[PDB]
């Protein structure tokens, strides 16, 4: 919906002793999960801002966490070179896949719910099986530290951004970089794709012409440390339009559930929501006293969450 965050906060959750790296929402429950730099993943009830529990399995700082479609498993990565899988019914680690040398930065479960992607400093992206834990295929082609990775809506296409200024889209079956993008002024840090409900809204936002099949094609977005947020086409690989105005380094980007606005956080201590179809909304909202690290938008509830380096997680209503 026209859900827009507002300057007043609801709860400023401060339980972490170390800077928070990422925050996500449970798919079904009224639960939000925050990973921080102290190797602990905390679980909160965002509706009332009540600390629920903590999972302290990880050795080094936890970097990225992700749920599945059903919300029954929680994939987590850390600097301890390992990927942990958490059973969310009882909240204990059930499978700790190793390998994938050096700090692991991002982890994600593609919607089929049977495999996991992982990216790390070792300049490659590994594929793991949830049931077994065997790395079955390894994606190479990034020449530098791969930062953030996200799959598609049906478990076939993957995007990997890295320090190497290139965003590469990979295919599950063929294991080939179908689209490689090298156009950013400085390092790309965060990526996120477009849901269904937004593709139509892109057509009049950019003027792109439909192909013979008529589908606009899958889409990307990439925010880069050069204070630029660029939204991209999977089928072609060409720029549609660019978002500029972020004061400092961008860290997190995602689309509004309605597929109409753009919500992004950056190291500019502020959260910016911007329109792209007609460039009307340019709302900047100070969020944290220090660097803001990550954010998330609830699929249905009018809530958003932001985790920052100040060891504090904040909740904003949407109006």
């Amino acid at each position: 919906k026209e859900w827009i965050p507002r300057p007043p906060e609801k709860y400023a959750l401060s339980g972490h002793r170390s800077p928070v790296t990422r925050v996500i929402f449970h798919p079904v429950f009224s639960v939000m999960v925050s990973a921080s730099e102290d190797a602990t993943i905390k679980v909160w009830d965002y509706e009332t801002g009540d600390f629920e529990r903590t999972l302290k399995g990880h050795t080094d700082s936890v970097q990225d966490i992700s749920f599945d479609h059903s919300g029954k498993l929680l994939a987590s990565c850390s600097a301890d070179m390992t990927i942990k899988l958490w059973d969310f019914q009882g909240f204990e680690c059930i499978r700790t896949m190793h390998g994938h040398d050096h700090n692991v930065s991002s982890v994600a479960i593609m919607p089929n719910g049977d495999h996991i992607v992982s990216a790390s400093r070792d300049k490659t992206i590994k594929m793991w099986e949830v049931q077994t834990g065997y790395c079955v295929k390894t994606f190479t082609g990034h020449r530098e530290w791969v930062r953030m990775v996200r799959p598609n809506q049906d478990g076939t296409l993957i995007a990997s951004c890295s320090n190497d200024q290139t965003v590469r889209v990979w295919v599950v079956a063929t294991k080939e970089c179908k689209a490689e993008l090298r156009e950013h002024e400085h390092v790309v840090e965060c990526i996120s794709w477009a849901p269904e409900s937004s593709y139509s809204s892109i057509s009049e936002a950019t003027g792109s012409e439909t192909k013979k099949s008529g589908k606009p094609g899958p889409f990307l977005l990439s925010g880069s440390r050069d204070k630029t947020i660029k939204m991209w086409d999977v089928s072609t690989g060409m720029c549609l339009m660019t978002l500029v105005g972020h004061d400092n380094w961008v860290r997190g980007v995602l689309f509004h559930s309605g597929g109409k606005f753009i919500l992004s956080c950056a190291d500019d201590k502020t959260l910016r929501v911007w329109d792209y179809k007609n460039k009307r909304c340019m709302k900047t909202l100070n969020a944290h006293e220090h660097f803001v690290t990550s954010l998330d938008f609830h699929k249905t509830a009018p809530y958003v969450v932001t985790g920052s380096v100040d060891q504090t997680v904040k909740v904003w209503e949407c109006r």
Binding site: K56, G57, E92, R95
Partner: protein, 145 residues
Amino acid sequence: TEALYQVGKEFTSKMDLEKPNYIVPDYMPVVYDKLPQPPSHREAIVNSCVFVHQTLHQANARLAKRGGRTMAITPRHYLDFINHYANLFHEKRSELEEQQMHLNVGLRKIKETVDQVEELRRDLRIKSQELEVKNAAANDKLKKM
């Protein structure tokens, strides 16, 4: 034997017990007859548990033959065995994870310390240079006067 194996599987399903690089021995001491022929790490562990439980029966038989006094081995003993296994696994794993976390933090602190020591050295160099320039200036101004 099947009941013991099934109880072990169901009780240790929560447990990690996953070694990807597990090497199947050429002659595995098969205890549970229906064990899969290429067993996994978890299946081997449960087989070991069942073997332990039967080893207790053999020990009681050996004591009875010699004429010693034996206590009955009951399935409650097996339940205690698997419960202790679960608790010890969780406790030891968590303790190791905590210790490694704290040691990593300490190593990071020491590395930051030595880096700051290298910064202090160059700060001292700059201080020495400026002291030199100042003293030289003052000496030769006195020389002027």
